[PDB]
Amino acid sequence: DGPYQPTTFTPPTDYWILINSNTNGVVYESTNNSDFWTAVIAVEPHVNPVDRQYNVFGENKQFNVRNDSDKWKFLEMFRGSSQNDFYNRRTLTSDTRLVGILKYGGRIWTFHGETPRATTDSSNTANLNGISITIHSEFYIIPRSQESKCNEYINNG
């Protein structure tokens, strides 16, 4: 199901959005503008610590990023309110360059840790239905029931 072109939309619940990251910089921005902000930054293999400027949620933010590994690093930058600083809540370390997000059961699910054993983690929100996403790369959509397939793709391509 896809690829779909980069766009902004409100994901329906119960579908994995699988994003084929094709450059460094911002992969997706997701917010409900109340208690949930996540931006994922892609950091290429083998770069020293650098202060890079990223356009996240309509603001230029300076993030210190680094990657000493042969894999891409997809940093989840999270804040729980509009006036809080972003922090690197989770990282996905990946040779596949695939990033996943799911709305299900009052929660946002993503993949974190290091391929080929990246696993799902959940963030709670009081407004799941209000979460929309701006996706910067081509993406695919997999039904939650096919998560076994989604895990496979995240971890093996």
CA 10 from chain centre, in angstroms, equals: 15
The domain in which residue 57 lies consists of 1-157
Given resolution (angstroms) = 1.7
Q: Give Cβ neighbours of residue 127 (< 8 Å, ≥ 6 apart).
A: 32, 34, 35, 36
In 3D, which of 65, 63, 46, 45 has the Cα closest to residue 54? Answer: 63
C-alpha 42/C-alpha 51 separation (Å) is 14
Work out how many domains the chain is built from and give that number. 1
Q: Which DSSP helix (H) or strand (E) runs through 149?
A: helix 147-156
User: Which of 105, 107, 102, 127 minimizes the C-alpha distance to 34?
Assistant: 127
Q: Are 138 and 6 in contact (CB under 8 A)?
A: yes
For this PDB entry, the determination method is: X-ray
Torsion angle of C-alpha atoms 47, 48, 52, 56, degrees rounded to 10:
60
Q: Is 100 exposed, middle or buried (0-12, 13-18, 19+ CB in 10 A)?
A: buried
